Scaffold this active site. Sequence first.
Site, short mmCIF file in Angstrom:
data_model
loop_
_atom_site.label_atom_id
_atom_site.label_comp_id
_atom_site.label_asym_id
_atom_site.label_seq_id
_atom_site.Cartn_x
_atom_site.Cartn_y
_atom_site.Cartn_z
N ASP A 113 0.80 -1.22 0.00
CA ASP A 113 0.00 0.00 0.00
C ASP A 113 0.83 1.26 0.00
OD1 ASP A 113 -1.87 1.97 0.31
OD2 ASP A 113 -2.88 1.06 2.08
N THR A 114 1.06 1.81 -1.20
CA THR A 114 1.85 3.04 -1.27
C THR A 114 1.22 4.26 -0.63
OG1 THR A 114 0.93 3.54 -3.48
CG2 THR A 114 3.00 2.28 -3.39
N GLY A 115 -0.08 4.19 -0.38
CA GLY A 115 -0.82 5.25 0.27
C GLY A 115 -0.82 5.17 1.78
C1 0Q4 Z 1 3.07 12.50 9.15
C2 0Q4 Z 1 2.24 11.38 9.77
C3 0Q4 Z 1 1.15 11.93 10.67
C4 0Q4 Z 1 0.00 10.97 10.93
C5 0Q4 Z 1 0.44 9.50 11.05
N1 0Q4 Z 1 -0.04 8.82 9.87
C6 0Q4 Z 1 -1.20 8.43 9.43
O1 0Q4 Z 1 -2.22 8.26 10.11
C7 0Q4 Z 1 -1.20 8.21 7.92
C8 0Q4 Z 1 -1.27 9.55 7.23
N2 0Q4 Z 1 -2.29 7.34 7.49
C9 0Q4 Z 1 -2.17 6.68 6.32
O2 0Q4 Z 1 -1.21 6.82 5.56
C10 0Q4 Z 1 -3.23 5.63 6.04
C11 0Q4 Z 1 -2.80 4.24 6.50
C12 0Q4 Z 1 -2.55 4.03 7.99
C13 0Q4 Z 1 -1.16 4.42 8.43
O3 0Q4 Z 1 -0.28 4.50 7.54
O4 0Q4 Z 1 -0.95 4.71 9.61
N3 0Q4 Z 1 -3.48 5.59 4.60
C14 0Q4 Z 1 -4.67 5.28 4.12
O5 0Q4 Z 1 -5.61 4.95 4.86
C15 0Q4 Z 1 -4.90 5.35 2.63
C16 0Q4 Z 1 -5.58 6.67 2.28
C17 0Q4 Z 1 -5.23 7.83 3.19
C18 0Q4 Z 1 -3.96 8.36 3.20
C19 0Q4 Z 1 -3.61 9.41 4.03
C20 0Q4 Z 1 -4.55 9.99 4.86
C21 0Q4 Z 1 -5.83 9.46 4.86
C22 0Q4 Z 1 -6.15 8.41 4.03
N4 0Q4 Z 1 -5.73 4.24 2.18
C23 0Q4 Z 1 -5.41 2.94 2.37
C24 0Q4 Z 1 -6.64 2.04 2.49
C25 0Q4 Z 1 -6.38 0.54 2.61
C26 0Q4 Z 1 -7.56 -0.33 3.04
C27 0Q4 Z 1 -7.23 -1.80 3.04
C28 0Q4 Z 1 -8.05 0.06 4.43
N5 0Q4 Z 1 -7.52 2.20 1.35
C29 0Q4 Z 1 -8.67 2.86 1.44
O6 0Q4 Z 1 -9.10 3.41 2.43
C30 0Q4 Z 1 -9.49 2.84 0.14
N6 0Q4 Z 1 -10.52 1.83 0.30
C31 0Q4 Z 1 -10.71 0.84 -0.58
O7 0Q4 Z 1 -10.11 0.70 -1.64
C32 0Q4 Z 1 -11.76 -0.17 -0.16
N7 0Q4 Z 1 -12.77 -0.43 -1.17
C33 0Q4 Z 1 -11.11 -1.50 0.25
C34 0Q4 Z 1 -10.94 -1.82 1.71
C35 0Q4 Z 1 -12.09 -1.59 2.67
N8 0Q4 Z 1 -12.82 -2.71 3.15
C36 0Q4 Z 1 -14.09 -3.06 3.06
N9 0Q4 Z 1 -14.96 -2.32 2.39
N10 0Q4 Z 1 -14.43 -4.20 3.66
C37 0Q4 Z 1 -10.05 4.22 -0.17
C38 0Q4 Z 1 -8.93 5.25 -0.17
C39 0Q4 Z 1 -10.78 4.25 -1.51
C40 0Q4 Z 1 -0.06 8.95 12.37
N11 0Q4 Z 1 -1.47 9.19 12.64
O8 0Q4 Z 1 0.76 8.39 13.12
#
Ligand code: 0Q4
Lengths: 99, 99
Positions: free
Chosen positions: A25-27
């Site tokens: 997951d690059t996102g």
């Molecule tokens: C500088 C960092 C500060 C904040 C720091 N980071 C975060 O919280 C970061 C930004 N969050 C993220 O990067 C999170 C992943 C969790 C993580 O990495 O911790 N990324 C994500 O959640 C990214 C989108 C996003 C990015 C940034 C902000 C908000 C949203 N999506 C990843 C996620 C994967 C899925 C399996 C749950 N995909 C989705 O949410 C996509 N959903 C889908 O494609 C769905 N149809 C499939 C799964 C759902 N299941 C179901 N229906 N039964 C949607 C974008 C269309 C922290 N809180 O410690």
Amino acid sequence: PQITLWKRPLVTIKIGGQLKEALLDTGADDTVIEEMSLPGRWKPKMIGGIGGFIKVRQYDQIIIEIAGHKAIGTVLVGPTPANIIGRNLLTQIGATLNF
Amino acid sequence: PQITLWKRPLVTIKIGGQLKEALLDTGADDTVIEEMSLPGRWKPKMIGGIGGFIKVRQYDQIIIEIAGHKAIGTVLVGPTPANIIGRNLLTQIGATLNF
Ligand SMILES: CCCC[C@H](NC(=O)[C@H](C)NC(=O)[C@H](CCC(=O)O)NC(=O)[C@H](Cc1ccccc1)NC[C@H](CC(C)C)NC(=O)[C@@H](NC(=O)[C@@H](N)CCCNC(N)=[NH2+])C(C)C)C(N)=O
Ligand SMILES: [Cl-]
Ligand SMILES: [Cl-]
Ligand SMILES: [Cl-]
Ligand code: NA
């Protein structure tokens, strides 16, 4: 390998001796896996996604194999819809996005 | 290009005549953009991820320019915390994960 995106980029991971499926997951900044037991202490973290924020358990320096590549790093454990391999470990296995 | 993942894979997109920044997200099935107007008909949809679900508007056959590459497909619009380019449009610009 080269992985196209017509289907979800699902790979096998090995953590705690257990095989699981996870999404590359690059996102995702971080790696998040469904409830399981891991050794050591944990620290709290809040993470955000599309639906809002959740609390997870942060475990540092966990050994995890991803698609046959060894990584050692932070794994978050909590109520995630899917096991996700985020950039913290994608960088360890040398992954890039190309087009 | 080849995009490393030390940082978030952010690109400039053009949609509905507007320039936006968006995340290339191999973990997203769908493309989701912050609130905006788009032409034509739409239908309501629920999409989920970490934190739960949000309600979005689904527009079909929308053209987007992604880092200079045109693509057409479904775009979802709603209260997403980030603009996300998901697999439905990543495929069209020939994006792959490589390691
Ligand atoms: C500088 C960092 C500060 C904040 C720091 N980071 C975060 O919280 C970061 C930004 N969050 C993220 O990067 C999170 C992943 C969790 C993580 O990495 O911790 N990324 C994500 O959640 C990214 C989108 C996003 C990015 C940034 C902000 C908000 C949203 N999506 C990843 C996620 C994967 C899925 C399996 C749950 N995909 C989705 O949410 C996509 N959903 C889908 O494609 C769905 N149809 C499939 C799964 C759902 N299941 C179901 N229906 N039964 C949607 C974008 C269309 C922290 N809180 O410690
Ligand atoms: Cl790490
Ligand atoms: Cl589509
Ligand atoms: Cl292809
Ligand atoms: Na349309």
